[PDB]
Design an enzyme around this catalytic site. Sequence first.
Site, short mmCIF file in Angstrom:
data_model
loop_
_atom_site.label_atom_id
_atom_site.label_comp_id
_atom_site.label_asym_id
_atom_site.label_seq_id
_atom_site.Cartn_x
_atom_site.Cartn_y
_atom_site.Cartn_z
N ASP A 195 97.87 18.06 46.97
CA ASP A 195 97.09 17.15 47.79
C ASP A 195 96.25 18.15 47.92
OD1 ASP A 195 95.86 15.42 49.03
OD2 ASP A 195 97.41 15.93 51.08
N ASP A 216 98.82 5.52 55.63
CA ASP A 216 98.45 5.35 53.98
C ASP A 216 98.49 4.11 53.97
OD1 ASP A 216 97.99 8.13 54.38
OD2 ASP A 216 99.36 8.61 54.00
N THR A 245 90.21 11.53 48.42
CA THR A 245 88.95 12.26 48.89
C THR A 245 89.28 13.05 47.70
OG1 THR A 245 90.81 11.71 50.41
CG2 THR A 245 89.77 14.39 50.17
N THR A 246 90.16 13.18 46.44
CA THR A 246 89.40 14.20 45.36
C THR A 246 88.97 13.97 44.66
OG1 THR A 246 90.96 13.93 43.76
CG2 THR A 246 91.61 15.72 45.71
#
Lengths: 524, 462, 531
Positions: B48, B330, B81-82
Amino acid sequence: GQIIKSIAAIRELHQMCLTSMGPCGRNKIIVNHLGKIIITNDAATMLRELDIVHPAVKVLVMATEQQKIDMGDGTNLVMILAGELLNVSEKLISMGLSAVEIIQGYNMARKFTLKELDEMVVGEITDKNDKNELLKMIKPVISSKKYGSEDILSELVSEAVSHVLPVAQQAGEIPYFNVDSIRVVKIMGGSLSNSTVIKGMVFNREPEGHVKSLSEDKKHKVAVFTCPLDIANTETKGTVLLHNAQEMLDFSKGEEKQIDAMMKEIADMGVECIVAGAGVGELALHYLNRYGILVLKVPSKFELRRLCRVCGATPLPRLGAPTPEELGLVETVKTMEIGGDRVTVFKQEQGEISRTSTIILRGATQNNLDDIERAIDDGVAAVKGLMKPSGGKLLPGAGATEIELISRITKYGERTPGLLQLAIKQFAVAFEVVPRTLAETAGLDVNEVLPNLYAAHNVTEPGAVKTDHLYKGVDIDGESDEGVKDIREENIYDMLATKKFAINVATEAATTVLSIDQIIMAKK
Amino acid sequence: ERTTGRQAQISNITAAKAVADVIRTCLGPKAMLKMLLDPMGGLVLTNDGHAILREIDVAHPAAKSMLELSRTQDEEVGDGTTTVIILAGEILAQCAPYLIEKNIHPVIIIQALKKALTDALEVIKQVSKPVDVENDAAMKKLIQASIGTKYVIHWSEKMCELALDAVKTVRKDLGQTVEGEPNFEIDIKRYVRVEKIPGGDVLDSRVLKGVLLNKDVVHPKMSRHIENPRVVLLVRPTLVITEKGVSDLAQHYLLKGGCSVLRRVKKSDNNRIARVTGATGTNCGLFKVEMIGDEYFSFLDNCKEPKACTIMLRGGSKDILNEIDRNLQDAMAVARNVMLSPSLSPGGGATEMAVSVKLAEKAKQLEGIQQWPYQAVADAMECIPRTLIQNAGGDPIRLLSQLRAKHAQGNFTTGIDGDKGKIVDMVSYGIWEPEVIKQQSVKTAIESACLLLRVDDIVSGV
Amino acid sequence: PKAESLRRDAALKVNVTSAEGLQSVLETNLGPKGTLKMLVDGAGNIKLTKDGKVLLTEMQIQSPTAVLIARAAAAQDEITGDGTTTVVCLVGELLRQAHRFIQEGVHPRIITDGFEIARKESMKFLDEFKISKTNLSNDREFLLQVARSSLLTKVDADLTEVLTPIVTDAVLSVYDAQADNLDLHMVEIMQMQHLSPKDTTFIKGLVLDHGGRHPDMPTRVKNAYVLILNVSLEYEKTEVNSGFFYSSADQRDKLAASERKFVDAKLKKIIDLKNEVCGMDPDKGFVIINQKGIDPMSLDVFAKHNILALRRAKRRNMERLQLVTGGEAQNSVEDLSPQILGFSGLVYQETIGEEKFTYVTENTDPKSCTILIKGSTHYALAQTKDAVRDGLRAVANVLKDKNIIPGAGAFYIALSRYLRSANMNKLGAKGKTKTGIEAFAEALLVIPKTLVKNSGFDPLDVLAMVEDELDDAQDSDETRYVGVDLNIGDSCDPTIEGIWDSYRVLRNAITGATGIASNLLLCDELLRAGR
């Protein structure tokens, strides 16, 4: 990562050539180890005086010499373009694209460019050899070298070319114009406006005699004697010595009567000029003054070769045999003062058309004196490019050629499927260094002139037929302007033989560097 | 101390680029695991990106600004996010030769990124396809992407129904041209906050609208059913609710008044009561206090949809409900993106390629100084799907050129598959992603990349 | 202008290299032919253990790659309890076999995904290879050879015949025949020095620490009643605060004996219970536990009646005595009942000056066992205890799971042969999957080569004899299992030799080593942060 550092080593010498091409170019002073300073603006001649260490640069130097030997013009276009092909290929190597397909991509892009060169021809040179017609070809050659002299030197070079060329048309079998037909001489004093054009070689030395010049008679006979002037003796040894004072009177009077007897037979044949390649004795100059024979000494064997193609004279291995069949004929020879010193020149009138001419330069600057001498040599090879191999066709210059090729190459990129699209797109981007170089060295803003160049060749026209102005190139400005201007106003064009030959050499230049992944050397 | 000249612009680019280049392996379901070396004997084995970036010590302040962007992006949506960090770092990499070597003014690059941000959003809307938000069976498949391959796979049948009613409770459909577009006013943090009660069943778990309290009636004999109960926070009210405790003396005084005394009420829950009531309680639906799961409950609900509530989670044990917490939050982030607009985007990098193709063709017609940085943006948009290609084992050179050529012929929905590794269609094989993540990935990356170029000097001082 | 393909390879090679150093250390001690490793802290702690998990807990490794290797055995010891070294050998060798494929340009995902495909196919061949054993209690003769697999590994094989009946009779005595389960917590292990390790014997009951000291105590007592005594027999004081006032020393004994009458009054009721039930009958005895202390006055009183006196008993050991003996704890003497007495057999106490142990053994339904490991040196106590705890947990999964697998590299060689020929017939995965299956098949052949390498026999000759024997067995239309014989060097029949491994031990070994070794190659870069 040695292939990347090899480009950085060339990048150090790449910026040196970026300041060469264009009006901002300057000669470089090189002090030889022998105490001689050779100054030239030409890049090909500069590479001969520079010592190249890395052999990767030698590949570009050997490719530059190819441009000077054959076409003689475009050496700056070969070195700068080949250096940019390595910069655009550096991103492809770092991206993970193998150099194998990069080399294969240039071969496909080179064939697409050569086929479009025939459709880009604007005008066609009729090879009229007129004084006004040669002004269009010579102007861009003098341009981007020395500023302000393009107007004065245009009439001097174009006039000397028309003198050595005979009257012919539509005949390419027998060649006429050579590279040695134009010689450049220099003398201290004078200016560029007072310079004239001579139809033959110019001799700046002294006549070494009391006879300044010959008469006005038509068809003067000129004889070249390689044997020195002296009494005939044995070829082996034969040194004149005096054992006693009795033989002195016989040996002294014998040399005077023998030389005078040979000069009388030559003067009776109508020969008013004697060319002695070797030294001339003291008693020989006394008889030549009374007979009215011009004294000329040419120790250099290179100057006698071009003399045989003008009057038709032939060197004689012996002395005293004036064969009328091998004698030359010149219409008029005169001795006038040019440049502050009285010298004996060589020219003609009507008959015996000379195949070699010499332009006399005058000026008060020593640095700019040798600059024009090396600049004319680049213009001599421009006349040679008028022959059958695409001599009449021409393409617009001043950066307009490299920009126009961008739209044509990118159009064929999406047409060819596969991985070749990466090398085709980068091949057109590499042409952007030419317009950016002229704008950066001249002080023009990149955010201003550069976007106006792309909008000049790319417009929206409601129709299939092109219109408006496709001739807009890169402008140096110098006074004021808005955007760019048409190149056809100044009539600056580039020959097809020069541009087409420069593409094949620049393509194979970057191909060698990208194909070498390892270099092994040893100390000397 | 201080960095001036052109060296400061290079340090600003390499600061956010060095962080983005390391997390390139954290994208996609094929993302490779990472190993960090802590001073303690432990290590971080998870892939993550949000957990790894928080444990990395950075020096240059540009990397600190990229960390705050990941925290904000993680709150909006669960994944991606990445993607924002890599996209913002690649733009600075492609603009490095233009800012340094080409000597292009930075505001010109910043102004061009603002113009390209509008064009990038218009292309994604055209590639997106309409979807029905009122279908209960279709929303279960959209959430299923965040359900399967997790511990909830056994309850996946029950989780898709529980996550469906959890989203339907907070959302309300209202629109008009009079007062404007309310955008449904959906907040996951405060309104969708869940309370885990041990025991019960997952299938029998329902979403109640209101605040749930564990405090029962303070009197042994009292009416447990009120017709119209009135909630009062602190007129002859039917109920009395006190934030703090209540002594037994006040029990007999309010007993004859026909009202119940309720003490020990949290302060954070009083804000949500104002939505179902309005007290700074008429029309209250159900007063039933009936015990469920050996614990006394209370019903504050009504016949109206205030869009505020506390979801009651029940399961086999507390350890099971703990994993449901992060899994349900999520999962609702994907369903929330569906209600923001009836459109879906192709996954696997097809949306990333759709912008780069349309940007290069449109930039050629502008003919201006901004045309050059548009080519750097199109190259950065292609690195996101190419990063998955490097992790899929396929040739990154061959699969990148063949995919771009298919956009000129076929549609823009054709992406790259992680399982196979060859160019395939995303729609036919059932690979979909919401458009809201694509809108937040492009907008936040461009806005963050411009702020990094605005600082030409590092000032040291307190 | 920086875009680097140089990120292909990274410290991952060092991660594989760091695992190669750990492999060479744990390659020598694998199997019964292995070596006994010794670690010394320097403070006087010396432990000799061949187990890999036990040694890694006492050694700190800075390399994070070897940290997950030690953590992978955490689930093995708590479930399987055997094969911790074998799992490590499968993780390290698999990285070496994949090292050649990484340099050729093979992407690690196909290498990783290829291991999960071969792991799922190995489970299908595992169900056919296993043999189901009945739960009948007549298999004890077969369980003797199975228990030797864990015993021969940790010792020199000289003490295996001594510990064979002890380990076998420990579990089967307290385990009724049904599904149920077995509990190893009820088996206590005690140690005493100044004796030889060959004197280890089986204990049916519980061993007590402090024994009675007196020359007249009976050595052997048969058929004695165990009685829990919760009252303190030590010196007692008056329930109210007082003092001893005496003018002469003779008057002090009058006041001191007044407080001693409380203890003597309770002793009169205890001695009457012995003579009440079978007082004069032969082969009878009366034993007092008395967890609390003993006064010196009762030493001569209990000696005349031949009553065993004990004191200072562990509180945890008292809970097991209630199950073994059956007697309830008696707090008060006045409430003592004759039904509180339990049942016991012959009780003999060994006389040793240092310590004296009381044997609770020979009971009808003890429902408990004790394994007494005694040795003179320090390493003899730690080495033998490691073999017993590993032996009890290895047999633990044998009785619970009815399936048994032959050991000595029987499944490792067979599975590598099945997966080799099955990949060419199926071809349903991918063409690039062959790199992962071939690397996984060759990684399983290191275990039979590791066992023979420590014995000195050529590993190349034993590999050819097994492959040539399996080819002849298929054409003969029969089922014959082949295994590696370390003593002779040729093949062997694992059914006749008696080498067998549990099903759950090898199931989690292949599955556990596959996921951990695959996650190692997934590391792109090693980052150092947090300090």
